[PDB]
Amino acid sequence: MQIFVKTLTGKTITLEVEPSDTIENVKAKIQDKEGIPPDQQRLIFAGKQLEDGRTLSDYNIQKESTLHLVLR
Amino acid sequence: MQIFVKTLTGKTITLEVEPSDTIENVKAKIQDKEGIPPDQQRLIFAGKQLEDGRTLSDYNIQKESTLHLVLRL
Amino acid sequence: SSFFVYCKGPCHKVQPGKLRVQCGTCRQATLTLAQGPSCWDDVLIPNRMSGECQSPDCPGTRAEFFFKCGAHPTSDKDTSVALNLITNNSRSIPCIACTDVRNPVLVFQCNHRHVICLDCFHLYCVTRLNDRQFVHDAQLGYSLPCVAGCPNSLIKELHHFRILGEEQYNRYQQYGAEECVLQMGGVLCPRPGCGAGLLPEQGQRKVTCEGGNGLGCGFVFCRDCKEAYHEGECD
Ligand SMILES: CC(=O)N1Cc2c(-c3ccc(C(=O)N4CCCc5ccccc54)cc3)cnn2C[C@@H]1Cc1ccccc1
Ligand SMILES: [Zn+2]
Ligand SMILES: [Zn+2]
Ligand SMILES: [Zn+2]
Numbered sequence: 234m235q236i237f238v239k240t241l242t243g244k245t246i247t248l249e250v251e252p253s254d255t256i257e258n259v260k261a262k263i264q265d266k267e268g269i270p271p272d273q274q275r276l277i278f279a280g281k282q283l284e285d286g287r288t289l290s291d292y293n294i295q296k297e298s299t300l301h302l303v304l305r
Numbered sequence: 306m307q308i309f310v311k312t313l314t315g316k317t318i319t320l321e322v323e324p325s326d327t328i329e330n331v332k333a334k335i336q337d338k339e340g341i342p343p344d345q346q347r348l349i350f351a352g353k354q355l356e357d358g359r360t361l362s363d364y365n366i367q368k369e370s371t372l373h374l375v376l377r378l
Numbered sequence: 379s380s381f382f383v384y385c386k387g388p389c390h391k392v393q394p395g396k397l398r399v400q401c402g403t404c405r406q407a408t409l410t411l412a413q414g415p416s417c418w419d420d421v422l423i424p425n426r427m428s429g430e431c432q433s434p435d436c437p438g439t440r441a442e443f444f445f446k447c448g449a450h451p452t453s454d455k456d457t458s459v460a461l462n463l464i465t466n467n468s469r470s471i472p473c474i475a476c477t478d479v480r481n482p483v484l485v486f487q488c489n490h491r492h493v494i495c496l497d498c499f500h501l502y503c504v505t506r507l508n509d510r511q512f513v514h515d516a517q518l519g520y521s522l523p524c525v526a527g528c529p530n531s532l533i534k535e536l537h538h539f540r541i542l543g544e545e546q547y548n549r550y551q552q553y554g555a556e557e558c559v560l561q562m563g564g565v566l567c568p569r570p571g572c573g574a575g576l577l578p579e580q581g582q583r584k585v586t587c588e589g590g591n592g593l594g595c596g597f598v599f600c601r602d603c604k605e606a607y608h609e610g611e612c613d
């Protein structure tokens with residue numbers, strides 16, 4: 234499935250993820266597309282800062298929903 | 306988003322609005338299209354008068370939902 | 379939890395919903411919430427809850443909640459209205475109308491918290507609307523009370539009446555605007571086909587349905603008898 238990450242500038246990127254992907258996977262997949270080291274990657278979904286140890290499903294991240302990225 | 310303002314007679318107006326737009330903005334947007342002074346405009350949604358200070362989101366007006374317009378003298 | 383929304387978009391029906399939050403100033407989804415909401419008022423009343431927007435140059439603090447249909451992907455601004463009276467039948471209460479145990483259900487805000495399934499709630503609204511037995515309240519709108527006749531049980535969020543379906547829902551909005559002007563002290567233009575909502579002055583017996591082109595029909599009539607204005611009395 235695909236999910237969307239919207240950046241602060243507004244440009245919306247598209248990732249292929251699986252629900253078991255951890256948030257780590259997602260940050261790697263984001264730097265692959267846009268080159269931002271995960272160290273500067275803060276992801277927000279539903280008013281919660283997204284934690285490295287958990288998986289997309291842990292947060293009920295469903296197919297074709299949107300994460301927002303904020304840098305450090 | 307789009308919303309519609311209907312009269313009871315049937316006349317339909319079509320507006321571009323944002324959910325944060327206040328009822329006063331809506332009434333201005335109407336006078337831009339129709340020449341009706343906002344003072345003469347009464348807006349109704351689901352049988353409730355809309356208060357000039359509150360927003361479309363205050364009444365949970367959805368895209369392509371319809372407000373009713375009635376005129377005062 | 380399990381929320382329910384009316385999805386006027388693809389589903390055209392009541393569906394489980396997502397609860398989402400944006401910053402109240404930059405209308406973006408970067409606000410971190412201090413604590414989860416714990417009751418409907420937290421998400422229904424504005425500025426009931428506070429957080430920190432993570433947009434670099436935004437000081438937003440106010441949580442603005444909204445719901446989406448949960449039955450399919452949605453664009454982040456394709457919203458649906460939360461039908462807050464609808465909930466899962468966790469305690470498995472039989473419908474007060476068909477006495478069938480069903481899920482989800484609508485729970486009225488009357489003291490007994492009476493339960494009705496959506497099919498029966500549908501039938502309630504339609505017949506009450508055909509009969510013109512919806513009730514108008516100047517603060518609340520065109521609504522209905524608990525079916526069992528309980529007091530102080532007028533549904534507050536009027537989007538529950540989306541259960542009427544699209545055609546009956548639009549008729550409901552029209553009847554309610556008709557009852558609104560009448561409650562306002564106005565009168566409905568009697569000319570068949572016109573039906574304007576008129577707001578003449580209080581003393582005025584000579585009402586003229588003249589808003590302009592397509593607005594009024596031109597008829598001049600008598601509030602009391604509803605005929606073209608005479609100068610005598612209503613026989
Ligand atoms: C953005 C937001 O708020 N959330 C919360 C929330 C709920 C939820 C539902 C019920 C409850 C609940 O416990 N109650 C109490 C009883 C019924 C009720 C009715 C309305 C509201 C809350 C409740 C709590 C919460 C369901 N999805 N998300 C998504 C998102 C996740 C989150 C973000 C940031 C901080 C904490 C959590
Ligand atoms: Zn839907
Ligand atoms: Zn903000
Ligand atoms: Zn039933």
Ligand SMILES: [Zn+2]
Pocket residue numbers: 486488489490491492524525526527528531
């Ligand atoms: Zn009751």
Ligand SMILES: [Zn+2]
Pocket residue numbers: 567568569572573574587594595596597
């Ligand atoms: Zn008329």
Ligand SMILES: [Zn+2]
Pocket residue numbers: 600601602603604605608611612
């Ligand atoms: Zn008369």
